[PDB]
Amino acid sequence: GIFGAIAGFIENGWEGMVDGWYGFRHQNSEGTGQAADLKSTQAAINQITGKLNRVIKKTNEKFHQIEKEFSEVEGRIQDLEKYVEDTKIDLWSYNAELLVALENQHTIDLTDSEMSKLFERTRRQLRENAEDMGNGCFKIYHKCDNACIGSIRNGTYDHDIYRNEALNNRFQIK
Amino acid sequence: GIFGAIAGFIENGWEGMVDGWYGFRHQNSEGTGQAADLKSTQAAINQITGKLNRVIKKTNEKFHQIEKEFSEVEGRIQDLEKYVEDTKIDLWSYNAELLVALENQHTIDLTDSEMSKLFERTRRQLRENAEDMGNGCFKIYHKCDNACIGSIRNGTYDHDIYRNEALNNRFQIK
Amino acid sequence: GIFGAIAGFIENGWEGMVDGWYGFRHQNSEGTGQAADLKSTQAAINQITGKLNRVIKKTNEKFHQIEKEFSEVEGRIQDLEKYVEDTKIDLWSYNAELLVALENQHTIDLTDSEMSKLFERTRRQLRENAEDMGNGCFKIYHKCDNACIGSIRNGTYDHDIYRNEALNNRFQIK
Amino acid sequence: NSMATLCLGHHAVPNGTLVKTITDDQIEVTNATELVQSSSTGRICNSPHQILDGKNCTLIDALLGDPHCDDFQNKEWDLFVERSTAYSNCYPYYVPDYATLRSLVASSGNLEFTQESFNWTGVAQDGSSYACRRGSVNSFFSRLNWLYNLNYKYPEQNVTMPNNDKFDKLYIWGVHHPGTDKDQTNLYVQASGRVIVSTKRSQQTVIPNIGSRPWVRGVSSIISIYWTIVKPGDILLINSTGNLIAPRGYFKIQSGKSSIMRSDAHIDECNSECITPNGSIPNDKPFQNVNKITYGACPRYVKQNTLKLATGMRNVPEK
Amino acid sequence: NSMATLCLGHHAVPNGTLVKTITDDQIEVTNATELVQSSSTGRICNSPHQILDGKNCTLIDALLGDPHCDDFQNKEWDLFVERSTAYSNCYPYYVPDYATLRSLVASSGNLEFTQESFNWTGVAQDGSSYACRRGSVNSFFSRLNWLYNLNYKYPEQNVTMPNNDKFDKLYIWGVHHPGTDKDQTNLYVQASGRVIVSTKRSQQTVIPNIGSRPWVRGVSSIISIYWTIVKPGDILLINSTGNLIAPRGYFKIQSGKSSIMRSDAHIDECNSECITPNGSIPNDKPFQNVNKITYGACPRYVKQNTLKLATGMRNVPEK
Amino acid sequence: NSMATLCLGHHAVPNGTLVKTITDDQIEVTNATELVQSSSTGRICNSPHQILDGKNCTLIDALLGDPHCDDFQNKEWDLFVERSTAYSNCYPYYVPDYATLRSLVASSGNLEFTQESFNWTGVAQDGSSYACRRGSVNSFFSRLNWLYNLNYKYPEQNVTMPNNDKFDKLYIWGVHHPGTDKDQTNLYVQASGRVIVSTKRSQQTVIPNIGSRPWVRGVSSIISIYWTIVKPGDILLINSTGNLIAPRGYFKIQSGKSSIMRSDAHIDECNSECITPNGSIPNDKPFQNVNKITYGACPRYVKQNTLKLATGMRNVPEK
Ligand SMILES: *[C@@H]1O[C@H](CO)[C@@H](O[C@@H]2O[C@H](CO)[C@@H](O[C@H]3O[C@H](CO[C@H]4O[C@H](CO)[C@@H](O)[C@H](O)[C@@H]4O)[C@@H](O)[C@H](O[C@H]4O[C@H](CO)[C@@H](O)[C@H](O)[C@@H]4O[C@H]4O[C@H](CO)[C@@H](O)[C@H](O)[C@@H]4O)[C@@H]3O)[C@H](O)[C@H]2NC(C)=O)[C@H](O)[C@H]1NC(C)=O
Ligand SMILES: *[C@@H]1O[C@H](CO)[C@@H](O[C@@H]2O[C@H](CO)[C@@H](O[C@H]3O[C@H](CO[C@H]4O[C@H](CO)[C@@H](O)[C@H](O)[C@@H]4O)[C@@H](O)[C@H](O[C@H]4O[C@H](CO)[C@@H](O)[C@H](O)[C@@H]4O[C@H]4O[C@H](CO)[C@@H](O)[C@H](O)[C@@H]4O)[C@@H]3O)[C@H](O)[C@H]2NC(C)=O)[C@H](O)[C@H]1NC(C)=O
Ligand SMILES: *[C@@H]1O[C@H](CO)[C@@H](O[C@@H]2O[C@H](CO)[C@@H](O[C@H]3O[C@H](CO[C@H]4O[C@H](CO)[C@@H](O)[C@H](O)[C@@H]4O)[C@@H](O)[C@H](O[C@H]4O[C@H](CO)[C@@H](O)[C@H](O)[C@@H]4O[C@H]4O[C@H](CO)[C@@H](O)[C@H](O)[C@@H]4O)[C@@H]3O)[C@H](O)[C@H]2NC(C)=O)[C@H](O)[C@H]1NC(C)=O
Ligand SMILES: *[C@@H]1O[C@H](CO)[C@@H](O[C@@H]2O[C@H](CO)[C@@H](O[C@@H]3O[C@H](CO)[C@@H](O)[C@H](O[C@H]4O[C@H](CO)[C@@H](O)[C@H](O[C@H]5O[C@H](CO)[C@@H](O)[C@H](O)[C@@H]5O)[C@@H]4O)[C@@H]3O)[C@H](O)[C@H]2NC(C)=O)[C@H](O)[C@H]1NC(C)=O
Ligand SMILES: *[C@@H]1O[C@H](CO)[C@@H](O[C@@H]2O[C@H](CO)[C@@H](O[C@@H]3O[C@H](CO[C@H]4O[C@H](CO)[C@@H](O)[C@H](O)[C@@H]4O)[C@@H](O)[C@H](O[C@H]4O[C@H](CO)[C@@H](O)[C@H](O)[C@@H]4O)[C@@H]3O)[C@H](O)[C@H]2NC(C)=O)[C@H](O)[C@H]1NC(C)=O
Ligand SMILES: *[C@@H]1O[C@H](CO)[C@@H](O[C@@H]2O[C@H](CO)[C@@H](O[C@@H]3O[C@H](CO[C@H]4O[C@H](CO)[C@@H](O)[C@H](O)[C@@H]4O)[C@@H](O)[C@H](O[C@H]4O[C@H](CO)[C@@H](O)[C@H](O)[C@@H]4O)[C@@H]3O)[C@H](O)[C@H]2NC(C)=O)[C@H](O)[C@H]1NC(C)=O
Ligand SMILES: *[C@@H]1O[C@H](CO)[C@@H](O[C@@H]2O[C@H](CO)[C@@H](O[C@@H]3O[C@H](CO)[C@@H](O)[C@H](O[C@H]4O[C@H](CO)[C@@H](O)[C@H](O)[C@@H]4O)[C@@H]3O)[C@H](O)[C@H]2NC(C)=O)[C@H](O)[C@H]1NC(C)=O
Ligand SMILES: *[C@@H]1O[C@H](CO)[C@@H](O[C@@H]2O[C@H](CO)[C@@H](O[C@@H]3O[C@H](CO)[C@@H](O)[C@H](O[C@H]4O[C@H](CO)[C@@H](O)[C@H](O)[C@@H]4O)[C@@H]3O)[C@H](O)[C@H]2NC(C)=O)[C@H](O)[C@H]1NC(C)=O
Ligand SMILES: *[C@@H]1O[C@H](CO)[C@@H](O[C@@H]2O[C@H](CO)[C@@H](O)[C@H](O)[C@H]2NC(C)=O)[C@H](O)[C@H]1NC(C)=O
Ligand SMILES: *[C@@H]1O[C@H](CO)[C@@H](O)[C@H](O)[C@H]1NC(C)=O
Ligand SMILES: *[C@@H]1O[C@H](CO)[C@@H](O)[C@H](O)[C@H]1NC(C)=O
Ligand SMILES: *[C@@H]1O[C@H](CO)[C@@H](O)[C@H](O)[C@H]1NC(C)=O
């Protein structure tokens, strides 16, 4: 997409994540795990549900119109009755083709955005205790048990407690 | 929006910034102030004025056309006269409805952009002397008087002279 | 554009680059060089070729239609044959006018996007061994010969073997 | 040095669908939905729209009163369905602006007939014909009154009829074209004549033309069918030397959602807002590919038979 | 503390507006402007377009030359405005394809009448009637010449009139259908006849039908109004046995921005390029909701009564 | 020296191109491609569409068989080209709804004529005229048979001709309108006359009007031209007591992609899918400003003369 996160610096998706659209995978001292993120998932879904309802509009509903098939050759007036209906169908076929094209381009780019937004939210939160590895993963430089991981996934991660521990693990003689 | 800054990590907008659209707000030892950014404000207005002028403007000038109302039952030819005009009205109603949805979706996204661009442009300036608190505010690790703050609102902020002081406040026995 | 990279934090473009759409200029002990990045150049081209091929798409083969120029005064029926063709032309003119403006707006944004992607690719690649000068350039804090530079542009820069040398230059007395 | 990794990722599916975008032509998202209804059941649901199956009767034959169409008298409808197997079994006729007369009656929505007493003096009424047999017994169109000679005489006729109600009134009448100058005198005694049917706002004048016509059900003659709308405060004014196929009354002409459609589709017990000639179709989708002829709340006909709208991110499965 | 905190942000307002987007139905921005014109003064501006208030005269009644329409001779317009209070006050007439004649005269944009002396012989000219009365004095359609018997004779006419100019000529002629057989012979001595009006390109034939018509203003007769256009180098050629309401000349007929509109709106002294039957509306918006009938540089008629184009960012306010 | 700088950038060109966007009216990009095709050679390419050069004959004149148009008999076309230098050099005629008969014959795509033998009796055939000369030798339309009296007798023709084939049949015929009552009786020894042409589905009746018409090639008469289509199982019934311009057979009517266009452009041995009255144009672009009249696979006509689609990024050169 235009944000380069889905099909971009995230090498692939997770078929095994069925409780959301965006989520966390972690590896720490107690083991490994996976957890969907509800905010980003609900953000993307509510946008796609919204545009979907505008598209299935619904309006129209016509009753007595013009005849559109003819069993006799008639000439001028019939040439017009056909040209009008033909003109209209091409114009609506165009609208329908362009609508799906524009919408799908936007459906992809917004789902790309929601991924990038969840990454930036996580980046700001970790502050100076983690480095971006480049694949949507963070290396967290301090002991971060399940409580610490959970405090990131919910938005209550206090970087200050781990800052001194993390800053030392980053700077030395590697 | 798609950049997640307005109605994003910026929790709300300053209802009392009457002199601009985007701007700064500070607190140093001297006092707390506020000032709008002319560059980002003018950028957003000129794009919105631009699309406004394309959307207003002529030209639809029509002078002798078909009769749109009828006091008599006439049948076939009036059926067609009605169908042609009704067909035209639905198509334009669609064009108008879709036009406003696309413009407004983009009017919102481009303003969200200009917020994020001013932020990133600022972080490129402070380089290694400040940290992103994640809410839209920077924490600056050196003494920055009002002339120093004012030097951030223009390209004049020379990070080289504050680097040694800032790094020490960032890294110490914490 | 909306990513603030082209005509943005990159002041201007390089008329000296003709073998790519995006690239690297570098400066080290051995001197200067210039190489185009194929992956990003190709990515922006494949999209523009895609939309160019969708826009130029065989459709619209019509044969016997209505008459559209008249050499007699006939009134009601001719008024309609003209209103029909006139209504149609205005509609396809609007479709044409809007299609160009959307595709052109998107083409600018998406090319601006690919420049930003390449920058964020290079930034993550350098980890903690360089800093953003703001002009679109990175200041690398270690000895990086032409071979080293090559590994950066080519996904093979191993930041670990320079991290100690780099951090020593970034923090010290200066 | 006990570190920890935290990875951000997304949603992926084994069974993606290809959608279409501004830049790519086929691209795999996790999920999409169809926007073009392309299938029908082949049957017309009997509700919500009040269907009136014409069967062997066309709307005009029912209007005029073809004896085998008597079961359509005073019938109302939301959609009249004309069938290809229909026929005519009464006197041979032809209607200039047939399409127009059929159009305005179809949109009226009813065949509600109201009789009126035209003061014909000196003429024998209720003319019959072998070509329009009502079971081996002779008769004519039910809503038309054939005037012929009474005691080897025909007086030049004149009658007024006003519209004193608050609604437009639709009058259907005709003019007889005998096939030989023999039949012309044996019916109206005169050699040829004029029929002048007028209102304050309209004017109609017909001259009969004697001459042979294609043999149909016994007779080589034909009737021409004409219609006249009389608005409130206006007048209908017949004036005729002969050859007049007189009206018996008016039809209430209304405006509403009513229409007509040609289709041989069977009518089934179900419910569907949208009707097409080849069957009822659903209208949950915004576009449809079944037929450009529709009636009711329908999707808009388009040339495409499929347009998938993406409802998910790009699918990037197991690499 | 060696501290300083720099915050970046965006402005906001208390009173934001809701707008439609691709994603959301109602979302609050800081400022939007309306794109649909939905109001009018109720009055028509008489500039920059040259308006012609028809008053009690229809464009057809001015064309033919009604007495009370005398004030429209040789007049021009850009927008002719027919009123609902209009009436006729001359001989009863009817016009086949009235809609077409009105349409073509309206687009022509003038009534500039040129006199022409046709060479009628043996026939009384300037016939008048009790219906078309210019005071107590009986007179007739100003642009029409009623031909009738002279010394109890009417000789079959034949008269030419070539178009020796460079522009199109428009002739408005007619045919008389009298109520009685007696009136036919008092005016034209002979029985019903043929009026044959052809050109090199056109061809028109009318057969007068004597009959009783709706009694109007003293007469139970009627006049069928027809028209003819003569090309440069072409020739108008009349051949009438009788029953001819002959023309006094031609109208010049060229093309341009002229048209006609039914409306009862008063006319003030303002300036608005866009006219609707409801009055003038300002064309500063690209769409409008007043009327589908428009004349001039107008916004395009849509079905919505409001489309708010957002001209600001999201409104995010308080907590 | 412990230092190395890596700059990232994008290219530029010295000469951009201005394009339109949603935001700007003009903005510079490195590249664009035109979308409006607004030029042509001025020459219709004779392939891949079967072109037929009408030269001096309107399609109606070739249909009827004007002598100077005998080349065009039994021709086929995908596009018939009518030239402004066309003249008519036979008997004078006019066609009510000329436009329709021109439209339907042009859409049928051929002039394949099949001769049939009607059993005319007591009547002289192959009537010729001084106005329609085939080499200073009097003759007439090649597809019309002029019937007149034989030995002071014109027995009432009555003849049927059924369509026992798959293809529909198109018959062309006419009614002669003599100038004087003398010409009427000299040709048909009976005043007036009558022509009744019937199918089971259609009925055309014409009464010839005697009267002087504009002098053309020595005659003051004229011929009305009529057409009639007969579907399989149907019948063609002609009943004339005089003044019939009989047919000689039927035209084979088909339904295809044939049409007709007015131009004076020359025809070359090139090849182009799209045809305009200005010569062929390339259909590589999606829109065209050449003409709203097109034939075949063409770009859609728009009003803009240029619409540039950006094919590159913003062009930002030396500051
Ligand atoms: C002007 O020119 C036209 C055209 O030529 C001419 O019109 C012709 O008129 C005659 C009049 O009789 C008519 O004759 C036939 O009509 C019937 C044809 O019916 C079908 O026959 C076949 C299939 O069924 C098929 O080939 C045909 O195409 C058609 O579909 C037919 O009834 C007639 O046959 C009669 O023969 C004797 C006559 O008594 C009887 O033994 C028959 O039963 C039948 O008629 C009698 O039947 C019933 C029995 O109960 C009886 O009650 C009734 O009274 C009737 O007398 C003929 O074959 C032509 O069809 C018709 N042609 C067209 C094209 O219309 C005009 O007559 C001419 N004008 C003048 C003034 O002469
Ligand atoms: C064929 O069939 C038609 C149908 O009937 C028939 O036509 C009919 O003809 C009669 C007589 O001509 C006509 O009768 C009167 O119609 C007028 C309309 O009536 C109402 O409207 C008026 C207001 O708009 C007003 O008068 C009343 O409200 C009225 O109720 C009516 O006006 C006429 O009245 C005049 O008739 C005679 C003529 O002398 C007098 O009795 C009256 O006073 C009146 O005016 C006379 O007096 C004044 C006094 O000074 C005098 O100045 C004036 O000049 C005049 O002489 C009509 O009589 C029917 O309307 C009409 N039917 C229609 C139209 O449907 C044909 O006659 C039939 N064909 C044949 C050959 O017989
Ligand atoms: C009702 O009223 C109409 C109109 O008032 C009337 O129609 C008129 O009828 C007359 C008689 O037929 C006719 O008169 C001559 O018109 C011909 C056209 O003239 C045009 O030619 C010019 C040059 O071509 C051109 O500039 C103009 O457009 C001009 O108007 C004219 O050719 C005829 O005259 C030739 O023919 C006669 C007959 O032989 C000869 O006597 C003449 O000398 C002349 O040329 C002769 O010489 C040439 C050698 O050069 C020779 O080769 C040739 O054979 C010929 O003999 C016509 O006489 C009017 O044109 C016509 N007008 C209209 C409008 O139709 C009706 O007749 C009236 N109805 C009744 C029942 O009476
Ligand atoms: C188109 O424009 C032309 C140009 O003006 C018009 O032409 C004119 O037509 C009229 C009518 O056709 C012509 O007058 C007739 O001339 C003929 C010439 O032969 C003449 O026979 C006829 O008189 C006959 O008609 C009378 C009708 O009342 C009969 O009663 C009478 O017949 C009886 O009388 C004789 C006594 O002599 C007895 O022997 C018998 O008892 C007989 O039965 C009489 O013979 C008319 O006078 C006129 O000449 C002509 N003008 C020109 C310049 O050619 C067309 O009329 C016009 N057509 C339209 C408008 O449709
Ligand atoms: C909804 O309702 C509509 C209306 O019926 C249906 O749409 C029609 O579908 C039929 C197919 O079932 C279409 O008919 C086909 O198209 C062509 C039309 O025939 C042309 O060619 C002949 C001469 O060859 C001309 O005379 C004629 O005027 C036409 O120009 C043909 O190509 C097809 O012929 C095929 O069938 C015959 C046997 O039947 C074979 O022998 C042939 O070789 C050939 O293969 C056929 O006739 C029709 O055009 C459609 N549109 C209409 C009628 O307007 C929908 O199918 C129906 N259902 C749905 C779900 O939409
Ligand atoms: C600019 O000029 C135009 C032209 O007149 C005006 O448009 C008219 O607007 C009025 C009011 O909106 C319309 O009048 C009303 O329409 C009602 C519904 O219309 C349909 O429904 C009935 C079914 O009952 C059909 O029979 C009918 O033919 C219509 O198809 C009618 O019901 C109204 O009747 C009256 O009675 C009811 C009582 O039930 C009252 O409550 C109503 O108020 C009303 O007085 C009435 O007919 C009218 O149809 C419009 N005309 C046209 C041509 O569009 C604009 O209003 C005017 N101004 C502006 C700003 O645009
Ligand atoms: C259509 O074409 C047909 C061709 O068949 C044509 O039909 C013919 O019509 C005429 C008149 O309408 C018929 O003539 C009649 O013939 C019968 C047969 O015996 C006679 O009895 C009639 O005599 C009466 O008519 C006289 C008229 O002056 C009276 O004076 C006399 O006293 C008699 O009452 C009359 O002559 C003719 O028979 C038919 N043809 C055939 C083959 O039967 C018809 O006219 C055409 N219609 C058009 C062109 O409109
Ligand atoms: C509309 O309806 C009216 C009302 O009936 C009708 O008017 C009537 O027409 C008849 C026919 O013209 C008139 O009756 C006439 O009466 C006079 C009395 O003086 C007679 O002279 C007439 O007889 C003629 O008949 C011969 C032919 O057989 C002629 O050659 C001869 O010369 C005689 O004149 C004729 O019978 C009647 O007077 C009028 N009016 C009324 C009130 O009856 C009119 O015909 C209808 N309009 C149509 C049918 O178009
Ligand atoms: C146009 O017609 C109207 C009818 O509505 C005339 O208005 C009336 O005319 C009478 C007679 O002069 C006056 O007494 C009334 O006061 C008028 N107004 C009404 C009845 O409301 C009008 O005079 C006619 N002529 C014009 C407008 O020039
Ligand atoms: C934050 O993490 C804690 C674990 O310490 C958990 O109990 C809580 O539910 C999380 N917050 C939310 C909003 O779920
Ligand atoms: C900011 O930069 C420009 C150029 O010097 C000017 O607006 C202003 O003087 C500067 N402000 C400070 C505080 O230097
Ligand atoms: C990328 O890897 C190293 C960089 O020095 C080099 O050996 C290799 O050739 C590079 N790739 C290409 C295509 O040259």
Numbering used by the authors:
A (entry chain B), B (entry chain F), C (entry chain D): 1 to 174
D (entry chain A), E (entry chain E), F (entry chain C): 8 to 326
What's the publication's text?
The trimeric HA protein is critical for facilitating virus entry and infection of host cells and is the major target of neutralizing antibodies. The HA can be divided functionally into three major regions: (1) the receptor-binding subdomain (RBS), (2) the vestigial esterase subdomain located lower down on the HA globular head, and (3) the membrane-proximal stem region that is responsible for the low pH-triggered membrane fusion activity of HA in endosomal compartments. Here, we describe the unique human mAb H3v-47 that mediates very broad neutralization of H3 influenza viruses by binding to an unusual conserved epitope on the side the H3 HA head domain. This antibody mediates inhibition of virus replication using multiple molecular mechanisms including inhibition of virus egress and mediation of ADCC activity.
H3N2v viruses have the capacity for efficient replication and transmission in ferrets, and may pose a pandemic threat similar to that of the swine-origin 2009 pandemic H1N1 virus. To further investigate the antibody epitope, we determined the crystal structure of H3v-47 Fab in complex with H3N2 A/Minnesota/11/2010 (Minn2010/H3v) HA, at 3.57 Å resolution. Initial phases were obtained by molecular replacement using high-resolution structures that we also determined for H3v-47 Fab at 2.57 Å resolution and Minn2010/H3v HA-LSTc at 2.90 Å resolution (instead of the apo HA form at 3.15 Å, see below). A total area of 1061 Å2 is buried at the antibody-antigen interface (511 Å2 on HA and 550 Å2 on the Fab), where the heavy and light chains contribute to 61% and 39% of the Fab buried surface area, respectively. Major conformational changes were not observed in the Minn2010/H3v HA upon complex formation when compared to the apo form of the HA, except for differences in a few side-chain rotamers. In Minn2010 H3v/HA, there are only four N-glycosylation sites in the globular head region (at positions 63, 126, 165, and 246). The only two glycosylation sites N63 and N126 in the HA around the near the epitope do not make any contacts in the antibody-antigen interface. Importantly, three H3v-47 epitope residues on Minn2010/H3v HA, Q122, D133, and V144, correspond to the acquired N-glycosylation site residues N122, N133, and N144 in recent seasonal H3 viruses.
